[PDB]
Design a protein around this ligand. Structure first.
Ligand SMILES: Cc1cc2nc3c(=O)[nH]c(=O)nc-3n(C[C@H](O)[C@H](O)[C@H](O)COP(=O)(O)OP(=O)(O)OC[C@H]3O[C@@H](n4cnc5c(N)ncnc54)[C@H](O)[C@@H]3O)c2cc1C
Ligand SMILES: Cc1cc2nc3c(=O)[nH]c(=O)nc-3n(C[C@H](O)[C@H](O)[C@H](O)COP(=O)(O)O)c2cc1C
Ligand code: SF4
Ligand code: SF4
Ligand code: F3S
Lengths: 348, 1483
């Protein structure tokens, strides 16, 4: 008869002070300690029909884990102190838990039974702690599939979908190839997602593990004029299309022509590329330390742009959004199963 | 209904004995139920001695020789004459061939005009034949054997030729006159009985109940040798074992006649007939009647320390050659010169007898059976369990049971034989080898293991020593409907004892149970000596690896073993046939153990389903007469659950070895988890599995694994009848289903995926008792739950429509989902159909105990139902009296329906009268055959006060209704409830299973207003997971069977049909109505509306939404409202209205019973295994009425209370004045006071009336349920004796029973009260002047009694009050005692302690002055009201009486009372002191 959700309160792991966090482009969060992780995992009730696992769109918003993570199972394993088993069960579903442990907004946390009248359990933080402990203990090594049947799939795009597909086919026994336009593979993770939220060292380590597995990534290829679909099909059985979605809509209004307006995607890509190459010293990006920054259109991209400007020490930074501010508590027409739409006050 | 016998000890023969016997039958007729008409004889019979004088007088042509050298037959023939003379000629030819002479034939006069229409139509031609013994037969036993052989040959010839003739009796000492006749009709039909020449030393009599309205003359008894009252629950196993042993039987007495008498038992006969056939065969084989009775129904020797060494040795020896015939049985057998009477092991039937000074014995179920002179009565005794009442006419004396048992036991050296011939299997200690495979994951996947399975069934078993609990019973589809491959185990569902036999509590009655198992070859049963016990014996069928290895390596030539690999590749039939051939070869070689192994299996070879293999081998060996020569050991990986072990045992397995489960435990231990060692883990697993199997047996009431093994207590769901007949003969499969090819395909598929599985090194999560994405479908999935909650909170309709669509379509969850409407009719408009306001009146909220739920949820459900006009059900936890008054705002928290369960916790006169419907919970879907247990930590003060118990003290709800041991007892309870509330509807809640239609017909005969059918998918607050999943059947089959059977028997119009179990949509309601349900129950869905999210943690008292918990902190989170329930019910009603409009039905009665509107959908045909089901059984509409019209006229009128008591007591009750009256009472007056008590309670309530206000004296013998539900202010006196159920549900008042003034014998030695007394009593006091029977004060909760001796199982489940016993006490005293205090006066304290149960009680001495004074005052009142010599003597010797008294008190009760008293002394108020003590004792 566990009573953790009654006799334990939700907590957060070590977090750097926001004032000093703008001086360095590193992680803005840390994993839970062993005792804290055990206490937080004790909160989970081993949910009957866990709503933290449905992974489906409800009222136009996703609820639960779309990858059907065994959240109660590794919660109980963490509470009992079994880390290898928790990591194994987690990897049974998620092949890149390191990214999700610090990137995912955790709709599972919102769509959980304990979310009613009480805070939910830190599923994302527990996942991050599990994967970090596994990496530090060196339990993650290439599987080296002994069975390899001559077959080619030639995935296109190095985004997380591409990496997951490549891993699955390689484990099946198919020698695949991943084509990427940019120098560094990882899709959105390498460039779009800020280094602050996800340092690229872990991404590069993941690509190194995949290469050791035998994915054989190839970069600097637009697979357009460079490589044609006809020869692609001729030399490959399947080709897949993990092209993602980078097209950005604009505003067809007057005044959007004066020099000084650039895409958020381009700005973030240039900033991260310069930071990776020469620590933003090559001056091959946009800097507004002494220039005002107006970012219009909220969301993850807006938050990342604001954080980048703050670290660049812009004199003034402002965020614009048409939709009204979220309330501090769930409304009548927004109960627990739906994704919460309350004030968050996230990073940046 | 019942049995009786009137006899003379010395053998004097008269006609007054026969007349008295018919008088007893007439008196007992009131017990039986009422069928279509009263004039039709339900069934009766009379057995007497051979009337030589009458035959000589009435023949005048046949030369009858002296007494014992000629025999008399008795034959029922068809009205046709050609076959009649054909059978007569054949019988004469057989007699001449055997050498006996045919004296002649006679035709028995019959008065057909005195009989009912149906019995008139079915009346046969009654002709007797007289046989004269040849001179060679010196002794009468040889002549009786010759007649038996002749009768068996004639019966065999008749069945071969297809002729329908019956041999009612053929003996030289006994004659039977029986048929579909009432007691009054028997003498009229048989004009011979009127003649005074009829003289017999004894007359046995029986009257039946006939659950169904289509009995037969042959099925009526007395049978050839004995009368049996009750039921047999091991009939299939007994039949199979007997037909296996008959082939190997070899007797010198019969010689070559064994081939003629090979069938022994009749396949189409009833349980009583089969038992009689076995009894007579064993008697002729060379066994005395008493010996045969003891061997067939042995006393419980295992776990019973009250049995002597000789008796224990005898019963242990005979357990190796004859399994018990378990069940509630009262048996009375006779052989002309000897008469015997016995009861079952547990003594579940009543039997009282009188012995007079004129050497006359009157034995019967009831006591007020005939008028007797008290000055002539010598002894008033009862048939105690384990005691045989034996009379020898020639010797002219009653032979003591002690003498009989001692002689029979000492006739052979059974103890020496057991000590010598036993074989030991002591294993080597250094041969230890913890087995591991290195393909453990692959084998686990092949056999279906899951991470959920392990972590939630195997680890908890080790941790807790019991099968893990659960909640919210199965919502997943059946195996036949699930797309995923399923094990063959999931296709078989455990059965249970609902009516005609009760379940038992194995834990509390462990002295009755036995897990002993015999391995080896049985010896010569007819002539046993030594070799019969030269076998192995085990205390537990579950075998550890070391035990299995030792058995395999015994090597002993007499005890040989052979291993058969039950594996197949393509042809399952071929594999089974090779297994059969290997078994036969081993048997020929001399092997006595067959070890079916699933090991050495690979991707090419998949293991045969062990259940199928075991059943097929068992049936084959039984057919070939070789099963008794061997035993079956199973070594399978698909054996990790109590259900698996129980199924294997019940279908034939003698022992099982879960090597894969042991390996899983070893792996868990090695990887750090499960710190407990491998050996202790294995031992704990074995013990827990055996306990679970024992519970499964107790569900059906079988107390012995030996009987359960032969018995098949499982019913298949989705197995073809062809496969069933081939391998599971005797099992029920209503819809047939999949075939052997499909079974093999499923097994091969699972094996292939498991063995390939080249992606993951982990076990997939389970979905049996939880919902996982991509797992098995669950009806209450998150989508459905949230959609329903949102719809109910909005009061919105399209959301509800989406929820209904998701629940109904997109998956196949239930059988009803396989049906589709015709769609070719005349649709009407929604305005032409009945309103939702009228529709909702047929709905109910379902029973949910207050303790299981919270106060807020219970009151919300009650308020919603009352507002909507429906009915709410209060569970077995009682009700708060304050809820009977509507609140000022108009909300009513009263529950219209009040539930009556085995606990009888809150049952009271006020509780019963303040209701419109009284339900009797015979079983529920999740835990049908089980009871319950509420720990003290869960017994909060606000629950204890409601239930009338002490806070912090555990509560136990026994599985069975101790009143209801049979259908007659159910009828008696219904009568008592109707007396308590004449203005209420009596309902009986049963669970769907095979034969439930016949049980419903019997219930309708028992006069139940409403019959409720519950599916196995019903919810519960706490129950074992195995019981939740593998017990019960869907409500569709049961509802269809009940509807069809009631319509066929012409009882449908008399009863209202209700159904419940996963009724979530208007489509489900419509399907139930078409199947024939007028009312519908909804329990789980209202909870989901209130906020339940199917967490399945109700049993943990940790509901996050404050629905199924008593914690105030969690209750504060409750957000449910009655408005949401109202909206849900209205939406359901709107759905029903729309469906009715679409189908062109104007009214619910019009649509009910119209199965022609339904047809099999294309989805079912597309399904690869649901397309093999035969649903025509449900799609059938017999001609008749399809709606309740007749109000089920009860017998409230003509009752003693209405005729005499009320007309002279209403004015006194109204005025509040004293009133004393006196009546003469007979056994036909059953209740005698409940109506007056109900009137008092209605007028006043709990306060009742001032003490000793109404006084009712009764003279004579009282009927069943005397002084039931008598509230305060009423004082009943009884000069005479009473039957069972005295003081049932007493709510106050006084009951005094004193022996008749004319009876001068010792009251403390003479019996005066029936078996069950003060069951469920809450308050009051009583004074009994004599011994009582079994189960005295079973569930007392405050009643203080003084009794001069009691029987076994005394003070079983008491929770309060006091009991004073001025005499001896039976065994298993205080078995389940959680509260109250018992004071017993005895001389042998050691013997008393040995008799008592030591589990949860303490022994003390009377040291407190207050307690001593209270006991003295109680004895003073007893002696004042009784004139008891024992009480007077004790009062005179009070100083020594206190010293010799013994006190019994539960430990927790004593501690809680002491803590409360200490707090009161410290100066704390009652509520706060109780709360603090409860917290301290349950921290
Ligand atoms: C906390 C959080 C923050 C987020 N922030 C952002 C954000 O700032 N911006 C954003 O866009 N999303 C953001 N996302 C969303 C997330 O990054 C994307 O939804 C997801 O990573 C894209 O998946 P993908 O597999 O398509 O990856 P992709 O990276 O889209 O995969 C395709 C990759 O291949 C490249 N490519 C394109 N055409 C070709 C071609 N012909 N041949 C080869 N390669 C080609 C693409 O440029 C891209 O790098 C965020 C999500 C979270 C949870
Ligand atoms: C929490 C809970 C407690 C229950 N308690 C009882 C009970 O005490 N007695 C009983 O006869 N049925 C009990 N039931 C069963 C229901 O009253 C009803 O008979 C039926 O099983 C409900 O089926 P459903 O859950 O599919 O709607 C209980 C059900 C639930 C969910
Ligand atoms: S916290 Fe989430 S995963 Fe844990 S029990 Fe609650 S809903 Fe399930
Ligand atoms: S935080 Fe982790 S568990 Fe939760 S939804 Fe995201 S990936 Fe799944
Ligand atoms: S399943 Fe039981 S524990 Fe609560 S959420 Fe539902 S009532």
């Amino acid at each position: 008869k566990p009573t953790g959700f009654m006799e334990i309160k939700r907590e957060k792991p070590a977090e750097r002070d926001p004032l000093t966090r703008l001086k360095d482009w590193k992680e803005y969060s840390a994993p839970f300690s062993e005792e804290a992780s055990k206490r937080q995992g004790a909160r989970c009730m081993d949910c009957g029909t866990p709503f933290c696992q449905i992974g489906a769109d409800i009222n136009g918003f996703t609820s639960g884990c779309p990858i059907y993570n065994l959240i109660p199972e590794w919660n109980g394993l963490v509470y009992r102190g079994r880390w290898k088993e928790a990591l194994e069960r987690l990897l049974k579903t998620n092949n890149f838990p390191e990214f999700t442990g610090r990137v995912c907004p955790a709709p599972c946390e919102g769509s959980c039974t304990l979310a009613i009248s009480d805070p939910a359990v830190s599923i994302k933080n527990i996942e991050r702690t599990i994967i970090d402990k596994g990496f530090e203990n060196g339990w993650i090594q290439p599987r080296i599939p002994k069975k390899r049947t001559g077959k080619k799939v030639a995935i296109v795009g190095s985004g997380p979908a591409g990496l997951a597909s490549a891993d699955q086919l390689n484990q099946a026994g198919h020698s695949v190839t991943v084509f990427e336009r940019a120098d560094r593979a990882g899709g959105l993770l390498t460039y779009g997602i800020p280094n602050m939220k996800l340092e690229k060292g872990i991404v590069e380590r993941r690509i190194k593990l995949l290469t050791q597995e035998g994915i054989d990534f190839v970069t600097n290829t637009e697979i357009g004029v460079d490589i044609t679909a006809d020869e692609l099909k001729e030399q490959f059985d399947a080709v897949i299309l993990c092209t993602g979605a980078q097209k950005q809509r604009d505003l067809l209004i007057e005044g959007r022509d004066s020099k000084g307006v650039h895409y958020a995607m381009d700005y973030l890509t240039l900033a991260t590329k310069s930071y990776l190459d020469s620590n933003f010293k090559d001056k091959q990006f946009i800097d507004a330390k002494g220039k005002d920054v107006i970012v219009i259109g909220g969301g993850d991209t807006g938050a990342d742009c604001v954080a980048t400007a703050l670290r660049q020490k812009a004199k003034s930074v402002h965020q614009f959004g048409k939709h009204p501010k979220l309330p501090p508590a769930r409304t009548n027409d927004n109960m627990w199963p739906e994704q919460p739409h309350v004030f968050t006050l996230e990073y940046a | 209904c019942g049995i009786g016998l009137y006899a003379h000890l010395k053998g004097k023969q008269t006609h007054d004995i026969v007349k008295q016997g018919l008088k007893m039958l007439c008196q007992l007729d009131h017990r039986g139920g009422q069928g279509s008409d009263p004039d039709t004889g339900d069934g009766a019979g009379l057995l007497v001695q051979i009337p030589d004088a009458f035959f000589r007088k009435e023949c005048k042509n046949i030369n009858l020789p002296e007494k014992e050298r000629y025999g008399v037959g008795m034959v029922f023939f068809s009205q046709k004459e050609d076959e009649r003379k054909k059978i007569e000629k054949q019988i004469n030819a057989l007699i001449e061939q055997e050498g006996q002479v045919v004296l002649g034939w006679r035709t028995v006069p019959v008065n057909v005009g005195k009989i009912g229409t149906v019995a008139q139509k079915s009346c046969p031609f009654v002709r007797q034949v007289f046989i004269g013994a040849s001179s060679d037969l010196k002794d009468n036993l040889s002549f009786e054997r010759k007649l038996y052989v002749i009768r068996k040959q004639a019966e065999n010839w008749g069945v071969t030729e297809g002729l329908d003739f019956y041999f009612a009796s053929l003996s030289s000492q006994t004659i039977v006159y029986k048929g579909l006749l009432t007691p009054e009709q028997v003498d009229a039909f048989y004009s011979d009985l009127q003649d005074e020449a009829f003289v017999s030393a004894f007359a046995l009599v029986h009257s039946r109940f006939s659950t169904n309205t289509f009995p037969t003359w042959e099925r009526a008894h007395p049978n050839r040798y004995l009368v049996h009252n009750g039921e047999i629950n091991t009939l299939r196993g007994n039949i199979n074992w007997m037909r296996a042993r008959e082939q190997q039987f070899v007797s010198e007495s019969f010689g070559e006649d064994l081939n003629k008498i090979l069938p022994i038992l009749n396949a189409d006969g009833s349980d009583s007939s089969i038992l009689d056939n076995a009894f007579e065969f064993f008697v002729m084989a060379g066994r005395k009647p008493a010996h045969t009775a003891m061997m067939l129904i042995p006393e419980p020797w295992t776990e019973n320390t009250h049995m002597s060494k000789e008796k224990r040795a005898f019963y242990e020896y005979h357990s190796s050659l004859m399994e018990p015939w378990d069940g509630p049985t009262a048996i009375s057998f006779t052989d002309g010169k000897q008469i015997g009477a016995i009861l079952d092991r547990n003594g579940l039937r009543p039997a009282r007898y009188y012995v007079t000074k004129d050497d006359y014995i009157i034995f019967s179920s009831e006591v007020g059976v005939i008028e007797v002179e008290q000055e002539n009565v010598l002894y008033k005794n009862r048939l105690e369990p384990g005691k045989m009442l034996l009379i020898d006419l020639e010797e002219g004396r009653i032979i003591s049971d002690e003498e009989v048992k001692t002689q029979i036991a000492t006739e052979y050296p059974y103890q020496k034989w057991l000590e010598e011939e036993l074989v030991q299997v002591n294993p080597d200690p250094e041969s230890r080898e913890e087995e591991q495979f290195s393909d453990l994951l692959t084998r686990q996947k092949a056999f279906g293991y899951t991470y959920e399975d392990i972590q939630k069934y195997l680890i908890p078993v080790i941790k807790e020593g019991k099968d893990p609990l659960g909640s919210m019973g199965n919502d997943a589809p059946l195996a036949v409907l699930s797309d995923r491959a399923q094990s063959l185990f999931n296709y078989f569902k455990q059965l249970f004892a609902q009516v005609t036999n009760p379940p038992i509590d194995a834990i509390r009655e462990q002295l009755v149970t036995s897990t002993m198992t015999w391995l080896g070859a049985e010896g010569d049963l007819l002539h046993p000596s030594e070799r019969n016990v030269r076998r192995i014996k085990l205390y537990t069928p579950v075998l550890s690896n070391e035990q299995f290895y030792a058995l395999k390596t015994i090597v002993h030539p007499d005890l040989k073993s052979q291993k058969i690999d039950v594996l197949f590749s393509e042809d399952l039939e071929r594999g089974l046939k090779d297994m059969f051939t290997q078994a036969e070869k081993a048997i020929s070689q001399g092997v006595s153990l067959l070890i079916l192994s699933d090991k050495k299996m690979n991707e090419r070879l998949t293991p045969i389903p062990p259940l199928l293999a075991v059943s097929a081998l068992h049936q084959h060996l039984i057919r070939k007469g070789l099963r008794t020569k061997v035993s079956i050991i199973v070594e399978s990986g698909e054996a990790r659950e109590v259900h698996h072990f129980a199924a294997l045992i019940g279908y034939g397995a003698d022992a099982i070895n879960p090597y894969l489960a042991y390996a899983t435990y070893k792996q868990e231990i090695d990887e750090g988890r499960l710190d407990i060692s491998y050996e202790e883990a294995v031992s704990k697993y074995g013990k827990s599995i055996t306990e679970g199997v024992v519970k499964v047996m107790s569900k059906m009431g079988i107390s012995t694994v030996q009987s359960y093994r032969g018995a098949q207590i499982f019913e298949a769901v989705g197995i073809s009848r062809d496969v069933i007949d081939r391998y599971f003969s005797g099992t029920a499969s209503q819809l047939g289903g999949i075939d052997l090819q499909t079974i093999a395909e499923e097994a091969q598929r699972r094996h292939r995926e498991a063995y390939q599985d080249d992606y993951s090194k982990t076990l997939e999560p389970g979905s049996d008792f939880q919902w996982r994405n991509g797992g098995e479908h669950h009806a209450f999935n998150p989508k459905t739950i949230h959609t329903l909650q949102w719809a109910c909170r909005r009061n919105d309709y399209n959301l509800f429509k989406q929820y209904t669509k998701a629940a109904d379509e997109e998956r196949i969850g239930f059988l009803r989902n396989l049906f589709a409407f015709d769609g070719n009719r005349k649709p009407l408009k929604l305005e032409e159909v009945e309103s939702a306001e009228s529709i909702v009146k047929r709905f109910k909220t379902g029973a949910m105990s207050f303790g299981s739920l919270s106060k807020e949820a219970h009151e919300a459900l009650a308020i919603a139902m009352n507002r909507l006009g429906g009915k709410s059900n209060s569970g077995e936890g009682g009700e708060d009296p304050k809820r009977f008054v509507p609140d000022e705002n108009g909300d009513d928290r009263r529950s219209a329906i009040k539930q009556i369960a085995s606990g009888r916790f809150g049952v009271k006169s006020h509780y019963l009268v303040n209701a419109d419907e009284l339900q009797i919970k015979m079983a529920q879907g999740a835990k049908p055959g089980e009871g319950g247990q509420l720990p003290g930590n869960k017994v909060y003060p606000w629950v204890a006060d409601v239930r009338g118990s002490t806070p912090g003290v555990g509560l136990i709800s026994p599985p069975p209704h101790h009143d209801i041991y049979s259908i007659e007892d159910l009828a008696q309870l219904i009568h008592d409830l109707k007396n308590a509330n004449r203005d209420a509807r009596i309902s009986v809640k049963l669970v769907s299973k095979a034969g439930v239609g016949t049980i419903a017909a019997g219930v309708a005969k028992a006069t139940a207003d409403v019959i409720v059918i519950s599916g196995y998918d019903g919810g519960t607050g706490a129950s074992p997971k195995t019981s939740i999943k593998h017990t019960g059947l869907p409500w569709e089959l049961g509802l269809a069977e009940a509807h069809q059977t009631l319509m066929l028997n012409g009882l449908r119009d008399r009863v209202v049909l209700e159904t419940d179990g996963k009724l979530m949509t208007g489509r489900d309601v419509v399907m139930a109505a078409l199947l024939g349900a007028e009312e519908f129950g909804f329990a789980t869905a209202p909870l989901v509306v209130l906020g339940c999210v199917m967490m399945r943690a109700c049993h943990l008292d940790t509901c996050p939404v404050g629905v199924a918990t008593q914690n105030p902190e969690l209750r504060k989170k409750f957000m449910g409202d009655p408005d949401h329930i109202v909206n849900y019910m209205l939406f359901i009603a709107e759905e029903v209205r729309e469906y009715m409009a679409a189908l062109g039905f104007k009214t619910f009665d019009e649509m009910i019973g119209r199965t022609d509107v339904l047809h099999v959908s294309e989805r079912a045909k597309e399904h690869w295994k649901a397309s093999q089901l035969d649903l025509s059984t449900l799609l059938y509409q017999p001609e008749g009425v399809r709606t309740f019209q007749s109000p089920q006229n009860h017998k409230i009128d003509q009752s003693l209370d209405i005729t005499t008591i009320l007309p002279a007591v209403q004015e006194a009750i109204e005025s509040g004045k004293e009133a004393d009256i006196s009546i003469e009472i007979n056994n036909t007056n059953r209740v005698a006071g409940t109506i007056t008590g109900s009137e008092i309670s209605k007028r006043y309530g709990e306060e009742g009336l001032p003490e000793d206000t109404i006084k009712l004296h009764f003279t004579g013998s009282a009927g069943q349920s005397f002084g039931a539900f008598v509230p305060k202010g009423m004082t009943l006196y009884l000069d005479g004796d009473s039957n069972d159920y005295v003081g049932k549900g007493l709510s106050g008042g006084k009951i005094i029973v004193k022996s008749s003034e004319g009876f001068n014998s010792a009251s403390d030695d003479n019996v005066i009260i029936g078996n069950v007394a003060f069951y469920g009593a809450t308050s009051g006091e009583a004074y009994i002047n004599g011994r009582a029977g079994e189960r005295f004060a079973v569930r007392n909760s405050g009643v203080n009694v003084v009794v001069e001796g009691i029987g076994d199982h005394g003070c079983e489940y008491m929770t309060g009050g006091s009991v004073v016993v001025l005499g001896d006490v039976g065994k298993n005293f205080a078995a389940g005692m959680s509260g109250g205090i018992a004071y017993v006066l005895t001389e042998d304290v050691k013997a008393f302690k040995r008799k008592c149960n030591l589990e949860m009680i303490l022994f003390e001495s009377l040291e407190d002055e207050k307690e001593i004074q209270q006991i003295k005052a109680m004895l003073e009142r007893h002696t004042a009201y009784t004139n008891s010599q024992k009480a007077e003597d004790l009062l005179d010797q009070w100083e020594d009486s206190v010293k010799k008294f013994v006190k019994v008190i539960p430990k927790n009760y004593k501690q809680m009372l002491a803590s409360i008293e200490e707090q009161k002394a410290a100066g704390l108020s009652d509520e706060e002191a109780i709360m603090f003590a409860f917290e301290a004792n349950t921290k």
